[PDB]
Amino acid sequence: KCKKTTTCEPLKYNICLGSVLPYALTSTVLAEDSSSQDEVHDKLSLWSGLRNAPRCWDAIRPLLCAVYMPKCEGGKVELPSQGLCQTTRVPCAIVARERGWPDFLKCTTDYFPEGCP
Numbered sequence: 001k002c003k004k005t006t007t008c009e010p011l012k013y014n015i016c017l018g019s020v021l022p023y024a025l026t027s028t029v030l031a032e033d034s035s036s037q038d039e040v041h042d043k044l045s046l047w048s049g050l051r052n053a054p055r056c057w058d059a060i061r062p063l064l065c066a067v068y069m070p071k072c073e074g075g076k077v078e079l080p081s082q083g084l085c086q087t088t089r090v091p092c093a094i095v096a097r098e099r100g101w102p103d104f105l106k107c108t109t110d111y112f113p114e115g116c117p
């Protein structure tokens, strides 16, 4: 429940929304709106409109990077935590009003499990 088996690929984009990525491989399996690293970049580019809402941006950046550009190692990615997802619900409430959170970014425990290291 804490990890997902998947195939790892070398990172094509070395930075996630300004944040450095201290690992070599990733997977697009958690971002259900994205089937390639190029598409991941284009979806993150859309999300980047939230840079104009800094309180949300500060909360949502680690969530987006954990989902869109996760560390992949030995054919597995770690799922983001329930806690990390919950931190975004109030400062990024505008997302829910403007369009709605995609299902893979709603804090259900199948996508964001509890009690994992």
Ligand SMILES: CC(C)CCC[C@](C)(O)[C@H]1CC[C@H]2[C@@H]3CC=C4C[C@@H](O)CC[C@]4(C)[C@H]3CC[C@@]21C
Binding pocket: 033, 043, 046, 047, 048, 049, 050, 052, 053, 094, 095, 098, 099, 100, 101, 102
């Ligand atoms: C006050 C303003 C700065 C707030 C701006 C907020 C944004 C940039 O106006 C947000 C609100 C809803 C967001 C969208 C919510 C859901 C999705 C689906 C996802 O697959 C791609 C990103 C995308 C399309 C988001 C892009 C950024 C949006 C479109």
